[PDB]
Structure formats: C-alpha cells, structure tokens
Amino acid sequence: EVETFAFQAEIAQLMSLIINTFYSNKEIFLRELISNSSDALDKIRYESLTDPSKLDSGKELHINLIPNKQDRTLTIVDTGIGMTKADLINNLGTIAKSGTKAFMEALQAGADISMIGQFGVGFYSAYLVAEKVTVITKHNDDEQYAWESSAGGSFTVRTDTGEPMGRGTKVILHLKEDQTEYLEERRIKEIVKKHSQFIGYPITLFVE
Numbered sequence: 001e002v003e004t005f006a007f008q009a010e011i012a013q014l015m016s017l018i019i020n021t022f023y024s025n026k027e028i029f030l031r032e033l034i035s036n037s038s039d040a041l042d043k044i045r046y047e048s049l050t051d052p053s054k055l056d057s058g059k060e061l062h063i064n065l066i067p068n069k070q071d072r073t074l075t076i077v078d079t080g081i082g083m084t085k086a087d088l089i090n091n092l093g094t095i096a097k098s099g100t101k102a103f104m105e106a107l108q109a110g111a112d113i114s115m116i117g118q119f120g121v122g123f124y125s126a127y128l129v130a131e132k133v134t135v136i137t138k139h140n141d142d143e144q145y146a147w148e149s150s151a152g153g154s155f156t157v158r159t160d161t162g163e164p165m166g167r168g169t170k171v172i173l174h175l176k177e178d179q180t181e182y183l184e185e186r187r188i189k190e191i192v193k194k195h196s197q198f199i200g201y202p203i204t205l206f207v208e
C-alpha cells in the first residue's frame, strides 16, 4: 500500500519558498545532499565501533553519483546508516520544523538560500533542481522504504520492492526540464571539486 502524509505547515512553506524564490545559485543542492550522505556514513561508522555487526549489511562506506539522461534523474547513493519508517514519517520532520523556522527568519534578516545547511534542512534544497524527489532507504533496524514528494504539501511512503540495497540511502532527483546541466559529467565534477572536495568518503561519479 501507499501511505500519503501532509507536511507540517512550516516544511510545506519552506518547500514552496525553495520552489518559488528567484535564486540562480542552484548548484548548492549537491553539496547539501553529499553532506547528508557524509553525516549518514559518519553515523554508521561511529555506531559500528561499539557494534561491529552493524556492518554485516555492508562494510564499504562510500558515495556514488549516478546521472541518467534517459530517465532525466541524478541519483546520490550512499551506504550510510539509512532511515527507518519513523525517521521518514515523524523524526526528520520534527527536527526540521525548528530548522525551517530559523532558516526562514534568517532569510527575512538577509541570509541567502545557500546557507540552508547551517539550519539542518539542506535536504529540501533538492527542490531547487528537482520536480520530484524519491528517497529509497534501508536502515538495519527496518525494511526498505521509498519516500517520495513533488511538494504540493504531501509526501508518500511505501515499502520498496526494487533492487535490495543492503543498507543506506538513494536520493533520486527527477530533474526539472531546464536543470539537465546536472546530468553532465563535467558539471558534476566541477561542483564536487568546488563544494565537496574534502568529504571523508570516496565519491564515485558514474558516467553514462
């Protein structure tokens, strides 16, 4: 079954701002998603020091960037801690509410959209370039889920029946028609070098 949920008002508001605000420096979405991946990898790595069996679902800690011109998608894959159903439905949104509030206030103060990560809500920057975001995720303590939202105030969660992931997260960006530059090898290389050069995990840029 597919379950549909309403974003809390503040999150819907932030998503609308991200979609509606004129802001040319869209490339920062990638550093935010890679940051999310890095944090998730740090988390499982740290947890594994006390419980080595947490890596039974996979020892390699890495990030893959996968462009697909046929589907017009850019996929950011990591073998981080992943997310439970409760993370997807409740926990992330609960934490994000205060980050969203603070971010929107800072914006009203003169901050700009590129500072979104300082508020812990960098994930939503995905909507700078994507009409729809699909998040496939697998945490050790739960099943594989697909979260999805085209904004408009609602998201869906379902159990995922695609290729099993072992552990980690895939963020699938269904790019906007005018944002296909982010499928180009040289463009992604440029952005990673500029914003994500010191990430402590191998980042592999797949080619088409």
Ligand SMILES: COCCNc1cc(-n2c3c(c4ccccc42)C(=O)CCC3)ccc1C(N)=O
Pocket (backbone or CB within 6 Å): 033, 036, 037, 039, 040, 043, 078, 080, 081, 082, 083, 088, 092, 093, 096, 120, 121, 122, 123, 135, 147, 169, 171
């Ligand atoms: C320590 O790592 C646990 C959380 N990890 C992630 C979280 C997200 N992410 C998601 C959020 C979110 C909201 C605020 C902040 C981050 C958010 C959603 O609300 C939809 C699902 C994915 C997106 C991607 C990741 C990731 N790559 O692990």
